[PDB]
Amino acid sequence: KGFVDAKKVTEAVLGAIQLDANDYRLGNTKVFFRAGVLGRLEEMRDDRLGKIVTWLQAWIRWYLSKKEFKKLQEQRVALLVIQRNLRKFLTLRNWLWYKLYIKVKPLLTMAKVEDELKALEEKLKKALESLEKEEKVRKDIEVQNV
Amino acid sequence: GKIVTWLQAWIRWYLSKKEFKKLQEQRVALLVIQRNLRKFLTLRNWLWYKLYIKVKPLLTMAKVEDELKALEEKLKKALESLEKEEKVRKDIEVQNV
Amino acid sequence: MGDEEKKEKKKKSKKKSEEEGGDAAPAPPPPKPPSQKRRAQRSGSNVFAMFTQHQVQEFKEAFQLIDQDKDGFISKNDIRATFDSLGRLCTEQELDSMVAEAPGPINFTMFLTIFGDRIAGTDEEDVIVNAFNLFDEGEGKCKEETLKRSLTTWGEKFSQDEVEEALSEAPIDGNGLIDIKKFAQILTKGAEEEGA
Amino acid sequence: MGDEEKKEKKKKSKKKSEEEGGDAAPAPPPPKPPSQKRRAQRSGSNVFAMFTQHQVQEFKEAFQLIDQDKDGFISKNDIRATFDSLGRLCTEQELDSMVAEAPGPINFTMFLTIFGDRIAGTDEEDVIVNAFNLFDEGEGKCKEETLKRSLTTWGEKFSQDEVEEALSEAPIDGNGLIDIKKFAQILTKGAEEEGA
Amino acid sequence: MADLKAAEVEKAREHFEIYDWEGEGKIDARDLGDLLRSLDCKPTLAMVKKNGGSDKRGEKKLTLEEFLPIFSQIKKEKEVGTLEDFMEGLKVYDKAENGTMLAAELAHVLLSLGERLTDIECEEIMRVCDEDDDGFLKYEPFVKTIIAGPFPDEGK
Numbered sequence: 178k179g180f181v182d183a184k185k186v187t188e189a190v191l192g193a194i195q196l197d198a199n200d201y202r203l204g205n206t207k208v209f210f211r212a213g214v215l216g217r218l219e220e221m222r223d224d225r226l227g228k229i230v231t232w233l234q235a236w237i238r239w240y241l242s243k244k245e246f247k248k249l250q251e252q253r254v255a256l257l258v259i260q261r262n263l264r265k266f267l268t269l270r271n272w273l274w275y276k277l278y279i280k281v282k283p284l285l286t287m288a289k290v291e292d293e294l295k296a297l298e299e300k301l302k303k304a305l306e307s308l309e310k311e312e313k314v315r316k317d318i319e320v321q322n323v
Numbered sequence: 324g325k326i327v328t329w330l331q332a333w334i335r336w337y338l339s340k341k342e343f344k345k346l347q348e349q350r351v352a353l354l355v356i357q358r359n360l361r362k363f364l365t366l367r368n369w370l371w372y373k374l375y376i377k378v379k380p381l382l383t384m385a386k387v388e389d390e391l392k393a394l395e396e397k398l399k400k401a402l403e404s405l406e407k408e409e410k411v412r413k414d415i416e417v418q419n420v
Numbered sequence: 421m422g423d424e425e426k427k428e429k430k431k432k433s434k435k436k437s438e439e440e441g442g443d444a445a446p447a448p449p450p451p452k453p454p455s456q457k458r459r460a461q462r463s464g465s466n467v468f469a470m471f472t473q474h475q476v477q478e479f480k481e482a483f484q485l486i487d488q489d490k491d492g493f494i495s496k497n498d499i500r501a502t503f504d505s506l507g508r509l510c511t512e513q514e515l516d517s518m519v520a521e522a523p524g525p526i527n528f529t530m531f532l533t534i535f536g537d538r539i540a541g542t543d544e545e546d547v548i549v550n551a552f553n554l555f556d557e558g559e560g561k562c563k564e565e566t567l568k569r570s571l572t573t574w575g576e577k578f579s580q581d582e583v584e585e586a587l588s589e590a591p592i593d594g595n596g597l598i599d600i601k602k603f604a605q606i607l608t609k610g611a612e613e614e615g616a
Numbered sequence: 617m618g619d620e621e622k623k624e625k626k627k628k629s630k631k632k633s634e635e636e637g638g639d640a641a642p643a644p645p646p647p648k649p650p651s652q653k654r655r656a657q658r659s660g661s662n663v664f665a666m667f668t669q670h671q672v673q674e675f676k677e678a679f680q681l682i683d684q685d686k687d688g689f690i691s692k693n694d695i696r697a698t699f700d701s702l703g704r705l706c707t708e709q710e711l712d713s714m715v716a717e718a719p720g721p722i723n724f725t726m727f728l729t730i731f732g733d734r735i736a737g738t739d740e741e742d743v744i745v746n747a748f749n750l751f752d753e754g755e756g757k758c759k760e761e762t763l764k765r766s767l768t769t770w771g772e773k774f775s776q777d778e779v780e781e782a783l784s785e786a787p788i789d790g791n792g793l794i795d796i797k798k799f800a801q802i803l804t805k806g807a808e809e810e811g812a
Numbered sequence: 813m814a815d816l817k818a819a820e821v822e823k824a825r826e827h828f829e830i831y832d833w834e835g836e837g838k839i840d841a842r843d844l845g846d847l848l849r850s851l852d853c854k855p856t857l858a859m860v861k862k863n864g865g866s867d868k869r870g871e872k873k874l875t876l877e878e879f880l881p882i883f884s885q886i887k888k889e890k891e892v893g894t895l896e897d898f899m900e901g902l903k904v905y906d907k908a909e910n911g912t913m914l915a916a917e918l919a920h921v922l923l924s925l926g927e928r929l930t931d932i933e934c935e936e937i938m939r940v941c942d943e944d945d946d947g948f949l950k951y952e953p954f955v956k957t958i959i960a961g962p963f964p965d966e967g968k
Binding site for chain 4: 474477483484485487488489491493496498500501502505506507509510511612613614
Binding site for chain 3: 248251252254255256258259260263264265266267268270271272273274275276277278279280281282285286287288289290291292
C-alpha cells in the first residue's frame with residue numbers, strides 16, 4: 178500500500194516465516210543475528226520468495242534473453258546450406274573469388290570515399306559533441322582532485 | 324691502469340654500424356634526383372603525358388582531394404582523443420577515491 | 421504489360437537461380453513471378469553508390485589483361501573464354517549456374533550489382549562463414565572427430581572418398597578443425613594470387 | 617557434348633586486341649575432358665603505383681570529348697579540333713608521329729591499350745620527394761650550396777646552363793631549399809597541354 | 813683448416829658494394845675497420861693496426877681479394893674481449909660493488925684511458941644509456957647491451 182515506515186516494515190518481513198523472537202535483534206544500520214536460527218531460514222527464502230523478488234530477477238532474465246539468446250538463431254538456415262556445400266566438397270577448392278583485389282590498397286590515398294562522405298558531417302560533429310562532454314568532467318575534477 | 328681498449332672498441336662497433344644508415348640511403352637519393360633534374364628538362368616537350376590542369380578539370384576526381392586532406396586530420400584526432408580519454412578517467416577515478 | 425520488363429528480367433532473372441543444380445541433382449529452384457524478388461531478398465548483401473572518385477579506379481588499371489568488348493562489356497561468350505585462366509572447370513551441366521550471378525548485359529551501371537553480389541553471392545559471410553562459427557561458446561574451432569561423426573550419421577550418410585580428400589586437406593590448427601579460415605581464406609587482405 | 621563451351625569463345629576476339637593489333641597473343645587451354653584446363657592461371661600483380669591515381673583515369677572518361685564526331689575512332693582531325701579547344705597544338709606531322717606510335721586506328725580499343733603498357737619514364741612521387749629527406753641530418757633545411765656543388769661534380773656533370781636554369785626556380789627560404797616544394801615543382805598536378 | 817662459407821662471402825659483399833662509393837672495386841684501409849664492425853665483428857683499432865689498416869683515408873686501397881683473407885684471419889682470433897674481461901674492468905669503478913656507477917666518473921676515465929674516446933663518443937654513449945635523476949649507469953646491463961649490439965626490438 179504505497180510506501181511504509183523505514184522501521185515498522187521490518188517486523189512483518191521478519192515475522193512472515195515466523196522467525197523465533199529471541200534470536201534476532203534490531204539496530205540502526207547493523208542488524209544482529211544468532212547462529213543456528215538465521216541461516217537455513219535464509220535458504221528457505223529461495224523456496225518461499227516468489228512474487229516480486231523473483232519477478233525483478235525474471236524481468237532481468239527476460240531483459241537479457243530478449244536481446245541476447247543468439248546461438249541457435251541463424252543455425253538452421255546455415256546448417257541446410259552446409260549440406261548444400263557438403264554434397265560438393267570434391268569440387269569446392271576449385272572456385273572463383275580468391276585473392277586478386279589486394280596489394281594496391283595500402284598505396285592509394287582517400288579510399289572509401291562516397292559512403293563515408295555521406296557519413297562525414299555526422300562523424301565530424303558528434304565526435305566533437307562527445308569530446309565536449311568527454312572532456313570537461315574528470316578534466317575539471319583535476320583541480321578538484323588537487 | 325690499462326682500462327680498456329677492448330670495451331672501448333666494442334663501443335665504436337655498435338655505434339658505427341648504426342649511423343651508417345644515412346650513408347646508404349643517401350647514395351640512392353643522389354641517384355633519383357640526378358635523373359629527375361634531367362627528366363624534368365627533356366620531357367617538357369613530349370607527345371602524350373602532361374595533359375593535367377588546363378582543360379582536364381572540367382571533370383571530377385581531382386576535385387575533392389585537397390579539401391579532404393585538410394578535413395580528415397580533424398576526424399582522426401577527435402576519434403583518437405575519444406578513445407583514450409574515458410579510460411584515462413577510469414584510472415584517475417581509481418586514484419581519487 | 422510487364423511482358424517487356426520480364427523479357428529483360430528473363431535474361432537478368434535467371435539471376436538466382438533457374439538452372440542451379442548442374443552436377444548435383446536438382447532441388448526446388450527460385451520461382452518465376454515478379455513479386456518473388458522479395459524472397460530473392462535473403463541475407464548476404466551490401467549496397468554502394470555510382471561515383472568512385474579514385475576508389476574502383478582499379479578496374480581501369482586491371483582492364484588490359486582480361487578484356488572483351490572494349491566499349492565496356494563482358495558478355496555471354498566471355499565466361500567460356502577468360503574464366504579458364506581465372507579458376508574452376510566449367511561443365512555443360514553447370515553453365516548458367518556457374519554464370520548464375522551475372523547471366524547478361526553487365527554494363528557500367530550493372531557492375532555495381534555484381535560487386536554487391538560479392539557480398540551476396542551464394543549465401544556469403546552471414547551464411548557461408550557463420551555456419552561453422554555458430555557451433556562453439558566463444559573463440560572456437562570445429563571439433564574435428566564430432567564433425568567426422570555427423571558426416572557419416574546425420575540424415576544423409578556420406579561416402580569415404582570425400583572424407584580422405586578432406587583429411588589431407590583439413591587445416592587443423594591444433595586440436596580442432598579451423599573451418600572459419602578454411603572458408604575465409606578467400607576474403608581477409610593478405611596475398612594476391614588468383615580470383616579475380 | 618563437351619563442346620558448347622569451346623565453340624562459343626570464338627566471338628571474344630572481335631572487339632578487342634586480336635584483329636586490332638595482335639602483339640599480345642592469347643592461349644586457349646581446354647582439352648576434350650574439361651576438368652583439366654585448371655592449370656592456365658593469371659597469378660601475381662601489384663608492384664608499385666602503376667596506374668598512378670592522379671594521371672590515369674581522367675583520360676578514359678574524357679574520350680567522348682576527344683572522340684569528336686562520335687564514332688570511337690579518333691582521326692588526325694578529331695585530335696586537330698580538340699587541341700584547338702585546349703590551347704596549344706602540335707603540327708600535323710608532330711601528331712602524325714603520335715599516330716605512328718600506335719598500330720593505326722586510335723579507337724577505344726587501341727588508344728587505351730597503347731596507354732595501358734606504358735608505365736616507364738617518370739618516377740613515382742615518393743621516390744623523387746624522398747631525395748633531400750634522406751639527406752638532411754634530422755630535419756632542418758638543406759643548403760643550396762651543397763646541391764650546387766654536387767650536380768656539377770659528383771656524378772653526371774651537368775652544364776653551367778643546365779644547372780643554373782633548373783636552379784633559378786627555387787623556393788630558397790634563406791640559403792636552404794624548401795625541398796619538398798621544389799620536388800613538387802618537379803612533379804605534381806600542374807602543366808598541360810601535352811597529350812592526349 | 814678453417815675457411816669462409818658462401819654465406820660469409822655474400823655478407824661481406826652486400827656491404828662492400830655500398831662501402832665503395834667510387835666504384836674502384838676496392839675499399840680504403842680505414843673502411844677495412846667499419847666493414848668488420850658492420851659485418852658483426854668487433855676488433856680494436858689496434859687489431860686493425862696489428863693486421864695493416866689505418867686512421868687516414870688515402871694510402872693503400874684493398875680489394876675484396878685482400879679483405880676476405882683478413883676476414884678469415886679475424887675469424888680465427890680469440891683476443892677480442894669477453895664479458896669476463898669487462899666484468900674485471902668495471903670492479904674498480906664501482907666505489908662499492910653494486911652495478912650502479914657514477915656518470916661523471918665514467919666520463920673522466922673513458923676519455924683518458926685504454927684507446928681513448930672522442931667528446932662525442934662519450935656524450936653519445938651516456939645519452940644512449942640509462943641516466944636516472946641520480947646519475948647511476950648500471951655497468952653490467954650496459955656491457956650486455958654492448959655485447960648485444962645496435963638494434964634490440966625498438967627499430968630505433
